[PDB]
């Protein structure tokens, strides 16, 4: 119930603060090929066919604008202390 445990939490769950989603865990080729061939180009110049190469409509826009939320910090120092007296640490894990 001392500095080692608090620092261990403060270093492992320090990337586990965003909330509901985004909780986090674990706390050759070398080709030289430039010589001729006739009809290779159609293997790389073709239309989309059945391969859909663009984005889904449901994720082209996002409403949170991929912002991090406002960081109410909630580290172990804010947990170990009181609210009306910020200079007293309580009987932690007692």
């Amino acid at each position: 119930f001392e500095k080692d445990l608090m620092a261990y939490f403060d270093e492992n769950l320090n990337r586990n603060w965003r909330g509901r989603e985004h909780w986090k865990v674990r706390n050759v080729l070398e080709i030289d090929f430039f010589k001729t061939d006739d009809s290779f180009e159609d293997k790389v110049f073709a239309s989309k066919g059945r391969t859909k190469i663009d984005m889904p409509i449901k994720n082209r826009k996002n409403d949170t604008h991929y912002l991090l939320p406002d960081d109410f910090h909630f580290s172990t120092d804010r947990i170990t202390r009181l609210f009306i007296k910020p200079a007293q640490k309580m009987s932690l894990f007692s």
């Binding site: 965003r18 859909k52 190469i53 912002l67 991090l68 109410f72």
Partner: protein, 823 residues
């Protein structure tokens, strides 16, 4: 052969030998210039473009992370750059625009862009990525183009910004940002709105890294850049300090509204990751201060030290960076009469940092003895408040900086202690003294007395003097016998910061009891807003010092948090949480006390109230802090806490979400019995959650507001992750024989026959294979899981993507049970 093949073997040789180690690019670009010159002097220009496209299209299947294609795309980039610099030197002094190297360049780029944009629709990722790269690297040196070609390019790139893979979107935002020379005016031919749409909307955290730097950064687009200081990715948060703010440099003090300039450095110096903090520290420490020529005073005049209270961190990032300015700044005799706000803040920071590191040299010389600083303090206090340029806000700041300089000063001179005690006693007796100076004056009067008893009797003396000053003017001004409202406010604000710093029981400190029976108990029973608020706060700071007072007034705290307004419920909830947190559980469940079930119902009524956001936030943080301190052992309240984490009505309290994001994992990880409690609650949590998601998914409203709740697969994953006995923080060894995760899985398979939806069963059954499987478990906790998986696999009809995971768990359980009964 003919020239159609001589050009082919030439370009083949140069693009083959230039594929390695960048060797001889000044010879490569040279011989490529000779063969393009001889080709256009011959006249096979479309054939030259065709073999160019041929030997380029022999590269386009090579992906990203391949150096051999990169050393050719940069070769042709160097080629078009060579033609561009030849035209730039041709328009100048000697008029080298001969042999039509403008027309050859224009037709060359008009044919080659038309070739590469034919390949932009191919289904392979590599050819699209290399086409948009081969445009984007050379788009800066392309220059002028045709309006039809510009329209085709902007249509292709405005479709490719919404391409499915991110690596081609990187080259898309590069080739977009090379088209930036316009006047900015906005509320699809403009690139800037497209880049802003990608800097907010794009799911890749890498496209923003190349849409964040390469933008124009004028007056209009700048918040769209700077709010990327709160980007999802860590590298973007560090890179806004690394390459955007460092790039502007001196213009950041005059081109950013100070509400954002006092927000960016707070977002930097209070981040959660070390590299972005170090980048903001090195930005406030190295680039800016060596950019305005070393003047610490000129930097502090632009870091607005009067309003923003963030600078007490940022100046520390100077003092831990280069100590030559720490040792260079000297405070002579002719500056204590003519302080400014910046140099008073500088003295504050340098003295408290010098006592933080205990450098005895700068404590010895270069700083005045305590009586001299007492003279300066009394000078500024009398020049502000004993009055009958020197604005009130600046004088208040100068007195507060020198009071923080005084609160940790050298006790060793008795003349200095005597002088500063007279100055603080003559300052805190002022009626019109402002509130932060009240706080820091009470702090100095604590930190310069001999003990806590002298500070108690001095503060009680000052507060009773300010009360007697009002009772005399109430007695005299007729020409009944109670103080006014404003003097009760001024007495309670001093009593708050006084009892903030007392750390002893109150049996031998009887002046606090006299203050309470005179003022605080007639402040709680009042009917004003602010008097009742400070009365409850002062009653709580008294209740953190004695237990009989807490057991007395917990009832009126509960009634005033159950039937009162917003701020009183705030302060009373903080006091209830803090009384529990200090005093343990002698506050409930006894004779004369409050019944704790009534307090749990009060906690319920606060916790289910969406209309009070911050009261719910402090209720959540409080109940989690009290669960960690093990004074709360109730079960249904923990069930309601985890539901309130996962409810959709509490999905707008961001602070409650972060409170439950931190303080529920530190519950179950810190102790095994806490994880056992989580595993006992998680069954009915998942049941009520699946019911709520079914009734939210089949609801018929034109604006339903769904998806606040997570999909229950991720809920089941995080329930497993909290209830996993690997991640316990203890050094146990026995934790490989705990059956809590399998008990949670057995309870989930029990409740699995209590849902109606056909997707819920799929995302419950497809995730049961993440459990702890090591054959060090008990016989029965494998036996019941084997029986329930048998009954669910046989008796109920399941689809194949669920029966895969279910019979895979059957195979793993059968292998482990064979290992169990082979011994």
């Amino acid at each position: 052969i003919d020239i159609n093949t001589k050009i082919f073997n030439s370009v083949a040789e140069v693009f083959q030998k230039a594929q390695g180690s960048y060797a001889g690019h000044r010879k490569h670009i040279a011989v490529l210039k000779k063969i393009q010159s001889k080709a256009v002097e011959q006249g096979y220009e479309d054939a030259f473009n065709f073999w160019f496209d041929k030997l380029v299209t022999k590269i386009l299947p090579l992906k990203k992370n391949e150096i051999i294609g990169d050393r050719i795309v940069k070769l042709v980039a160097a080629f078009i750059a060579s033609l561009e610099r030849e035209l730039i030197l041709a328009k100048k002094q000697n008029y080298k625009l001969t042999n039509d190297e403008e027309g050859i360049f224009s037709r060359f780029v008009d044919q080659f862009i038309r070739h590469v944009l034919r390949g932009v629709e191919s289904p392979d990722k590599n050819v699209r990525f290399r086409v948009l790269q081969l445009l984007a690297v050379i788009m800066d040196n392309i220059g002028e183009i045709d309006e039809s070609l510009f329209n085709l390019l902007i249509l292709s790139l405005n479709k490719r910004i919404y391409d499915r893979e991110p690596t081609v979107r990187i080259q898309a935002v590069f080739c977009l940002t090379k088209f930036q020379d316009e006047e900015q005016t906005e509320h699809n031919f403009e690139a800037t709105r497209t880049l802003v749409a990608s800097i907010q909307n794009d799911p890749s955290a890498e496209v923003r890294r190349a849409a964040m730097l390469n933008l124009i950064n004028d007056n209009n687009t700048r918040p769209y850049i700077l709010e990327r200081a709160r980007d999802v990715n860590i590298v973007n948060r560090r890179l806004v300090y690394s390459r955007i703010l460092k790039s502007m440099g001196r213009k950041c003090f005059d081109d950013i509204e100070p509400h954002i300039f006092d927000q960016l450095i707070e977002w930097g110096l209070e981040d959660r990751e070390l590299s972005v903090r170090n980048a903001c520290k090195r930005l406030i420490a190295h680039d800016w201060l060596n950019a305005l020529d070393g003047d610490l005073i000129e930097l502090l005049e632009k870091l607005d030290v009067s309003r923003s209270s963030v600078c007490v961190k940022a100046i520390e990032a100077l003092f831990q960076s280069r100590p030559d300015i720490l040792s260079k700044i000297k405070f002579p005799e002719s500056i204590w009469k003519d302080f400014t706000v910046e140099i008073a803040f500088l003295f504050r920071a340098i003295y408290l940092y010098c006592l933080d590191n205990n450098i005895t040299e700068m404590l010895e010389e270069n700083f005045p003895e305590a009586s001299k600083l007492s003279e300066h303090l009394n000078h500024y206090i009398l020049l502000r408040y004993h009055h009958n340029h020197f604005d009130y806000n600046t004088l208040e700041f100068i007195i507060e900086q020198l009071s923080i300089a005084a609160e940790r000063y050298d006790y060793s001179d008795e003349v200095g202690r005597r002088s500063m005690l007279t100055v603080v006693r003559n300052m805190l007796a002022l009626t019109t003294l402002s509130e932060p100076l009240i706080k820091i004056g009470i702090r100095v009067m604590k930190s310069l007395s001999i003990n806590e008893k002298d500070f108690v009797t001095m503060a009680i003396e000052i507060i009773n003097d300010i009360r007697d000053d009002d009772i005399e003017k109430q007695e005299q001004e007729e020409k009944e016998k109670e103080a006014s409202s404003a003097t009760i406010v001024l007495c309670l604000t001093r009593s708050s910061y006084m009892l903030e710093l007392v750390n002893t029981p109150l049996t031998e400190n009887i002046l606090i009891a006299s203050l309470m029976d005179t003022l605080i108990t007639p402040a709680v029973r009042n009917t004003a807003p602010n008097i009742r608020e400070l009365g409850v706060k002062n009653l709580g700071l008294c209740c953190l010092l004695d237990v009989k007072l807490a057991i007395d007034n917990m009832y009126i705290l509960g009634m005033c948090v159950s039937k009162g307004n917003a701020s009183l419920k705030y302060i009373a909830l903080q006091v209830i949480v803090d009384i529990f947190s200090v005093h343990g559980n002698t506050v409930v469940d006894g004779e004369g006390k409050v019944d704790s079930i009534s307090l749990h119902k009060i906690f319920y009524k606060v916790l289910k109230n969406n209309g009070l956001p911050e009261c719910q936030v402090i209720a959540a943080e409080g109940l989690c802090k009290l669960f960690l301190a093990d004074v709360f052992t109730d079960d249904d309240l923990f069930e309601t806490l985890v539901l309130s984490y996962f409810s959709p009505i509490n999905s707008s309290n961001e602070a409650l979400v972060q409170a439950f994001a931190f303080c529920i994992p530190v519950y179950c990880f810190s102790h095994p019995a806490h994880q056992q409690r989580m595993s006992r609650t998680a069954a009915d949590i998942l049941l009520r959650l699946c019911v709520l998601w079914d009734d939210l998914q089949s609801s018929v409203i034109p604006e339903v507001d769904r998806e606040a709740m997570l999909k229950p697969n991720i809920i089941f994953q995080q329930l497993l992750f909290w209830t996993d006995p690997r991640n316990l923080v203890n050094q146990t060894g026995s934790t490989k024989k705990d059956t809590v995760q399998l008990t949670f899985l057995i309870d989930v398979l029990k409740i699995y026959a209590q849902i109606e939806k056909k997707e819920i069963k799929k995302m419950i059954i497809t995730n049961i294979n993440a459990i702890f499987l090591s054959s060090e478990q008990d016989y029965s906790t494998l036996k019941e899981l084997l029986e329930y998986s048998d009954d669910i696999a046989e008796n109920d009809n399941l689809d194949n993507v669920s029966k895969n995971a279910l019979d895979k768990l059957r195979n793993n359980l059968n292998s482990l049970i064979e290992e169990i009964n082979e011994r």
